[PDB]
Scaffold this active site. Sequence first.
Site, PDB file in Angstrom:
ATOM      1  N   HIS D 126       1.056  -1.006  -0.176  1.00 22.38           N
ATOM      2  CA  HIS D 126      -0.057  -0.166  -0.181  1.00 22.38           C
ATOM      3  C   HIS D 126       0.670   1.190   0.264  1.00 22.38           C
ATOM      4  O   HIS D 126       1.720   1.406   0.777  1.00 22.38           O
ATOM      5  CB  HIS D 126      -0.917   0.006   1.359  1.00 22.38           C
ATOM      6  CG  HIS D 126      -2.016  -0.920   1.054  1.00 22.38           C
ATOM      7  ND1 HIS D 126      -2.990  -1.009   0.300  1.00 22.38           N
ATOM      8  CD2 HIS D 126      -2.338  -2.028   2.022  1.00 22.38           C
ATOM      9  CE1 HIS D 126      -3.860  -1.880   0.383  1.00 22.38           C
ATOM     10  NE2 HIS D 126      -3.484  -2.484   1.512  1.00 22.38           N
ATOM     11  N   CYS D 168      -0.024   1.683  -6.120  1.00 26.76           N
ATOM     12  CA  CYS D 168      -0.714   3.052  -6.648  1.00 26.76           C
ATOM     13  C   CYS D 168       0.139   4.110  -6.611  1.00 26.76           C
ATOM     14  O   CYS D 168       0.663   4.381  -5.539  1.00 26.76           O
ATOM     15  CB  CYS D 168      -1.965   3.074  -5.782  1.00 26.76           C
ATOM     16  SG  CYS D 168      -3.596   1.995  -6.225  1.00 26.76           S
TER      17      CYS D 168
END
Lengths: 208, 480, 494, 331
Positions: D126, D168
């Site tokens: 993440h 991301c």
Amino acid sequence: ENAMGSTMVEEQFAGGDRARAFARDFAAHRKKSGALPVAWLERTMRSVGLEVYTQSFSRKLPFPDETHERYMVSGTNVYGILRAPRAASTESLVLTVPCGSDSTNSQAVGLLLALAAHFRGQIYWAKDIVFLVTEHDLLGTEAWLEAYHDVNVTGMQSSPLQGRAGAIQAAVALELSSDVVTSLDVAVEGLNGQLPNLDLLNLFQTFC
Amino acid sequence: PYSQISGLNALQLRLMVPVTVVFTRESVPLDDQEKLPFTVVHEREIPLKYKMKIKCRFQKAYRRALDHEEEALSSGSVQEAEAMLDEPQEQAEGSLTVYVISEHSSLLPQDMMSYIGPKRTAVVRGIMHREAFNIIGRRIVQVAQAMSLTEDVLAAALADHLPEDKWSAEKRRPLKSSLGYEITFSLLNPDPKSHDVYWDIEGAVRRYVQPFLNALGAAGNFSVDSQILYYAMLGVNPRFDSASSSYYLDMHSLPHVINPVESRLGSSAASLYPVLNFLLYVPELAHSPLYIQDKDGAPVATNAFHSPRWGGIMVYNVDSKTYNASVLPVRVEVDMVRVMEVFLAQLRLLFGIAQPQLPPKCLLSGPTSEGLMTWELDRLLWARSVENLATATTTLTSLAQLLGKISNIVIKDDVASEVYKAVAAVQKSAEELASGHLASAFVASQEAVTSSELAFFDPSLLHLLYFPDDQKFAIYIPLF
Amino acid sequence: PPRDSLREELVITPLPSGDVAATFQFRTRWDSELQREGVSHYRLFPKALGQLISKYSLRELHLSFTQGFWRTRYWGPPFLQAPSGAELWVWFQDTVTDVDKSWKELSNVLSGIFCASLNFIDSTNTVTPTASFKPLGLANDTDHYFLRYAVLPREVVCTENLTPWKKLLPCSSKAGLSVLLKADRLFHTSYHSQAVHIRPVCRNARCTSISWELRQTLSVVFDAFITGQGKKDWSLFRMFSRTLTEPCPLASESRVYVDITTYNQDNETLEVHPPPTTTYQDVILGTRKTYAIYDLLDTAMINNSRNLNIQLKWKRPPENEAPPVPFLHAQRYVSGYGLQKGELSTLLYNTHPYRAFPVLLLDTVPWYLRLYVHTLTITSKGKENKPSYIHYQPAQDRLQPHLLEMLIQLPANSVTKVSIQFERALLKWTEYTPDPNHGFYVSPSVLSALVPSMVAAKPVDWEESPLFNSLFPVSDGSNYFVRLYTEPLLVNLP
Amino acid sequence: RSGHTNNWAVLVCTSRFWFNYRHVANTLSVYRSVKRLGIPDSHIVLMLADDMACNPRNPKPATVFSHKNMELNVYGDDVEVDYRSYEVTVENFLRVLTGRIPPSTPRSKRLLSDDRSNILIYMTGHGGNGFLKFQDSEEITNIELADAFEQMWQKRRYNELLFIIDTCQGASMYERFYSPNIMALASSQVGEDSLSHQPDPAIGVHLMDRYTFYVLEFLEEINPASQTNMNDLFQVCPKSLCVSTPGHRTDLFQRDPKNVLITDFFGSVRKVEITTETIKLQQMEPLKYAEQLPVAQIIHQKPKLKDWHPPGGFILGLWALIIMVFFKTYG
Ligand SMILES: *[C@@H]1O[C@H](CO)[C@@H](O[C@@H]2O[C@H](CO)[C@@H](O)[C@H](O)[C@H]2NC(C)=O)[C@H](O)[C@H]1NC(C)=O
Ligand SMILES: *[C@@H]1O[C@H](CO)[C@@H](O)[C@H](O)[C@H]1NC(C)=O
Ligand SMILES: *[C@@H]1O[C@H](CO)[C@@H](O)[C@H](O)[C@H]1NC(C)=O
Ligand SMILES: [Ca+2]
């Protein structure tokens, strides 16, 4: 809570006839006995594959009760444990059916036994599961909890427990007195105005 | 010591080697012998980069012959002369000695000017004609550069500091300097149902491998181990030839052969030192006659190959006659002498010691016991010293820069002690290299590299362990 | 003579609950001087483990990785038992000067070989027992100054641990019994344990010299409802998805033992489909047990043209004719509620009709759960029981744990309870785990005893007996030694 | 035409719990590929933050799957992990990269690369714009990574390096690189910041991310003797199969990508030399076992417990002091 929000469950339960037959056999035996049929419950619980235990309890009331018609109460609780195969006995979940003296909740017992028979054959449990049937409506539950945590909060007498399953994380109580239903109703308020976590109610509503 | 470290970045190294030249009676012209005691100097330089400079010099003293030397050099073979004339046997490493004999000598086959032997000594043939003393000097420097120092010898070391060229890659293939080395011999038995393989290592090591490593131990410490691996297989499947009734491993498949075995070789090492692996492979009965082929496709005599900085492998074929016994398994015994011949050749070639290159019309001595001559070992020591000094200087500069950049890193007392030790060792080693004492310089350079790398890799030099200096005002304002 | 030898044996035992247990065991003996520096050549004994004995002076080493919990009350007594997570206990040689430094170095070295996080062993989870964990091999003197012990109860055992374990075996999963070890089948179980033991033993019958023995063990239990739910019997193909085709060529003894004793009836045995080589009758754990022997080195049993698949009919016996419960079992739990104070309780059972026997109890507690020793109580049948021996070590914050060791005589046909109070501590915000709302673990407790026997056992020679009968030295023929582990506990802190 | 002689790989997963199954699956796929193509298990440093193969919630123990057909298990029969769940941290990763490791650390858990070594680094977790999170407590920024790589270059601990990140806004993590011979690839650009969510029914979780899925599918056809260059991995997972846009930075790198093979970073191809030389060689008391649980000896190994009493000298001192004080104010 992402532990439950990011996952998905595909149900595969199919035991309706078994639950019905269990209920019919439980009701007849309780009729004959005049109280909780203990030998039948133990034998049936052993047949589906659990570890079965019993507990006796008694107490004296401050004065006779007109609403429930009790003065001195004695009874027995029967509970069965499913041990998680790939873990140790550190955590546990509880599924309970409180029985009164009003000839109700036989279908709840049948559903409990069918669900235990379905759950017994899986590998993915990370916690133990306790299947509990109590004698008088809320006195049996109080006696069982006091014996489980080894605290004398109220003064109720009991035999010592022989089986435990770790720390309890959550519990669900079931009441049902008919083969079919038109709706499900939920209760959240507890003693002295205490409340549970909102996530449990959100989960129930997510499965509705 | 920041200023001294800033001075270490630009270092001048001057390597000097002592050569003693002895002119026997009636070798140089008599008029030429009038001024015989005098010193000549041959200096050359290696172009480099990054502000570090190196130069190499030969320091030749032309003393005349002592008479006893004539009885020895007079007649016989070269071996007897070496035996009798090696009486002093003093401690000198990086040093040479050359003798000049008459143009009619019968100890040197009368067809060649030079005789290179082991034990740091050589023989050269002079000129009775008085053309000059120049051809003597050319012949002597030719012999000295065949031994001793060359720009190619210092190519694996100094590799970063030298301008890159085509063929740079293969000059980087030898092993790098270290304190110790691990050597392990493994026997691979992929078919224990057919072959019962027993080998004698302890005697083989004691008889053949230990003298070799005793000779080679001037560079570092060595360890030897052994084991047997069952059901261990190769990573290619051999091709079959119906005409030969044999099996082949081709040259294109060799780079992929040793892949599966490395899953079982690793994770048994007992240290942090570089490890070398030598494998003996007994083929399965299903492809029993196995041969390795060259680029042309003809089978190789040794039936083995090696890989840079890793080790080598040899395949061992079982005799067809030994297969005659009905009882399976069949007891098979390996001949250790040939196996150790191949493996010791490979080990000598892995450190970078190639076959001597001879000057025209020269003669090399016969091979010695334990397979190594002394001047080759001294060459290795020179290279090791140079490499150690370069590494230590670079490490100290990097440490100083890192401590200059970040300000909240703690400098403990052990780190400073190690830094001082390293700088002192570097200076002492450079001085002793200039003076021509190779052994003490080698030891000092070892200490220098050890101390510098001990200081650089300290666990407390991690920037992440300390509170950021930017956020301290947040802490002191509320009660200030 | 090779001077080193290998033996392998698999034992299959049906359990009183309807489950089936299996145990694998590989053993090598070597007549070598491993305790002193000098050995450099290895054949059957692994090189990775062989050079640790001399570098760190080791007399004995024992290491285990386990998932699950052994249910003694419903499964019976086991051959060998281990706690959840990882445990390690070592006996050092008397020439060792500094034991703590060597202990730290050895743990760090083992962590690389076995792909486990044994570097988390420190002073806050290490104890020095004073009466427990005595040597299992030849011993002259027993000074507990040279013994260390540690347990990590949250270590996970997965395939990454089994790959190095199988790498140390000589046939290396390509021959013999090793072909049956398949990970997905091995972890579809209720109990799983891997272990390694090193100790010295007698060289011959006179026993005046030393030989070094390495033993690798693996044990699993297959549950009836989840596995083998159908009426089909317990065969090798359905338990392991594999059959036996050929023996390890390096082993001198290779066999499979199947327990065919029937407690209810007399001289009646369970049905094994392939006719066995031989039958073996002996007293095991204080009971006469009958085993069927399949000899894999016999060419009547296994050949090139025919392999082996053993089949066994077993179902949970009726309520009558079920075997009686063992003479000893125990439980552990936490009493109270809240986040301030609580109690730790243990229950010990003696189900023998007329005999009392003593037990030795060892407990270790982390420093954050502060204990009050004036609240310790031991009660049997409603009366106070006074221990014969008691040793207590108090904890120090962030330095060392609590240790409690007691010797208690248990009265016959009774249950005994042991209790002690504790208080919870508040830590600094940087001393919690990434998931601080899960809780902390108290390691399982150890129980050791000499349990009375139904039948008297004869003296036995270790070179001619099955490998499952030669794990513990036997002192008397009328008792046998057991070591039990309880379950771990989960406790929350504010 | 490369000029290296050994290969290394460091593969790291920085997630936690059971619902983060995807990151572990990606790491396992990379491990399977690099092993199949030749890199030994002693030259791979594998760090996994949580266990998903033997988690008690797993419906299929000891398996991790990439697709719902369940035809490829990426955990495999043969696997070895160096760093377990509680030893994966930003600090340990930085120590492994920089070599500043505690002295007692074993060989298998350190990266022992040199001047002739090619290294592959892969990361997943993440992340955000300029950071990647380890578990949930801490994070590593792009500046720190760029500094660690320069530390590695100054000591000459690699020849060429390949860095791949699957997160991301992963392109932010290679913006500050300034050392020679580094090539970097990413799955998404700075703007692209959402993540997909399609849980698998039988298992119960989202199985694997798209980019690594297509990258692993292109590495399943490549064999040890392949001639594929690094220009073919630059065209994998076009925005049409993914919904984000992959990026690459190759301006710090010296060779042309049309001449860089895949196996230079994903496999192990050795340089071989035939050997044609040889070195000439001339041709009464028996021992006993310990006793388990000796009761009498245990009972007598400790002196008996007597009750504690104050020493008499202390009593004498106390009362002498008190009366000496009393004789001043009274006499
Ligand atoms: C909880 O405490 C009560 C006392 O308040 C206990 O009650 C006594 O129980 C004994 C034995 O059963 C009786 O003989 C006494 O008459 C009881 N006393 C009173 C005042 O009722 C009770 O046993 C305790 N329960 C538990 C489980 O320990
Ligand atoms: C090599 O071993 C010897 C013998 O113990 C020792 O004295 C010496 O310091 C060692 N050399 C190195 C470079 O470690
Ligand atoms: C095993 O193979 C041998 C040789 O073919 C054969 O004689 C024997 O009958 C086979 N096994 C049996 C049935 O004993
Ligand atoms: Ca590794």
